[PDB]
């Protein structure tokens, strides 16, 4: 809710991208991707409540946005399997992260907004 | 000049992104990512010759663009560890895949151009 939020928009419809599955992973000491949190975007395109300040420790995180499943519910066969956002988090102390993604069938854009509480 | 080309642009400097490492992987039957091809973008930001028509069979591929090292070499603090483009390669008719990426320190945009020249 506070420390990690994901927002997804649809560049074809000019709308939030609703009901998009998002899976977050964190790299473990053995270099594997351990499951960290998951959820689905709301009617606003936003996904809150993935983690807490306590659990969102330093590490390398991967946010996987299940874009192919999204387009495959709207009649479009898209190019990408998903959109992946991989970043180191909290290495200089806690921050709040918003990961935004803008989706088209053959393209996506992503940006991050990082704030210090 | 092959079935798969990668082009990388720099949105801060308004230039090709030169000397960016690019690693391509193919998904194996056990769902792991197997190294497939790699190189570094040229002075034009392009990477040709990754694969051949013979070897680039249908399957799921991941193109990892090593953006963090690119920004670090410029003295710029970036957000992402790398940019990842994951897609299924499709044989329906003669097709050439160009993966293009536009890089900023906290953002990237990617698109696919799938043509038949
Ligand atoms: O693709 C090509 O053959 C090509 C050839 C010459 C010069 C540029 C490009 C791709 N540049 O495309 C721009 C772009 C790429 C990715 C995301 C957003 C944007 Cl605006
Ligand atoms: O809307 C919000 O509340 C928001 C807040 C913080 C960060 C991102 C966004 C979504 N918008 O930014 C994403 C975007 C806009 C235009 C072009 C490309 C892209 Cl990726």
Curated annotation (Swiss-Prot), chains A, B:
Keywords: Amyloid, Amyloidosis, Cytoplasm, Disease variant, Gamma-carboxyglutamic acid, Glycoprotein, Hormone, Neuropathy, Phosphoprotein, Secreted, Signal, Sulfation, Thyroid hormone, Transport. Changing residue 81 to Q: In AMYLD1; amyloid polyneuropathy and cardiomyopathy. Changing residue 27 to N: In AMYLD1; amyloid polyneuropathy. Changing residue 16 to S: In AMYLD1; amyloid polyneuropathy. Changing residue 60 to L: In AMYLD1; amyloid cardiomyopathy. Changing residue 34 to G: In AMYLD1; amyloid polyneuropathy. Changing residue 106 to H: In CTS1; amyloid deposit on carpal tunnel; patients show no other abnormalities. The modification 4-carboxyglutamate is found at residue 34. Changing residue 39 to V: In AMYLD1; amyloid polyneuropathy with carpal tunnel syndrome. One of its GO terms (biological process) is negative regulation of glomerular filtration. Not glycosylated under normal conditions. Following unfolding, caused for example by variant AMYLD1 'Gly-38', the cryptic Asn-90 site is exposed and glycosylated by STT3B-containing OST complex, leading to its degradation by the ER-associated degradation (ERAD) pathway. Changing residue 25 to V: In AMYLD1; amyloid polyneuropathy. Changing residue 39 to A: In AMYLD1; amyloid polyneuropathy. It is linked to Amyloidosis, hereditary systemic 1: A form of hereditary systemic amyloidosis, a disorder characterized by amyloid deposition in multiple tissues resulting in a wide clinical spectrum. AMYLD1 is an autosomal dominant form due to transthyretin amyloid deposition. Protein fibrils can form in different tissues leading to amyloid polyneuropathies, amyloidotic cardiomyopathy, carpal tunnel syndrome, systemic senile amyloidosis. The disease includes leptomeningeal amyloidosis that is characterized by primary involvement of the central nervous system. Hyperthyroxinemia, dystransthyretinemic: A condition characterized by elevation of total and free thyroxine in healthy, euthyroid persons without detectable binding protein abnormalities. Belongs to the transthyretin family. This is Transthyretin.
């Amino acid at each position: 809710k506070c420390p990690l939020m994901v927002k997804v928009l649809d560049a074809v419809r000019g709308s939030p991208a609703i009901n998009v599955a998002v899976h977050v992973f964190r790299k473990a000491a053995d270099d594997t991707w351990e499951p960290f949190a998951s959820g689905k975007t709301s009617e606003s395109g936003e996904l809150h409540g993935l983690t807490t300040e306590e659990e969102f420790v330093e590490g390398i995180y991967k946010v996987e946005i299940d874009t192919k499943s999204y387009w495959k519910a709207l009649g479009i066969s898209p190019f990408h399997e998903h959109a992946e956002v991989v970043f180191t988090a909290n290495d200089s102390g806690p921050r709040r992260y918003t990961i935004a993604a803008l989706l088209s069938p053959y393209s996506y854009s992503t940006t991050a907004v990082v704030t210090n509480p």
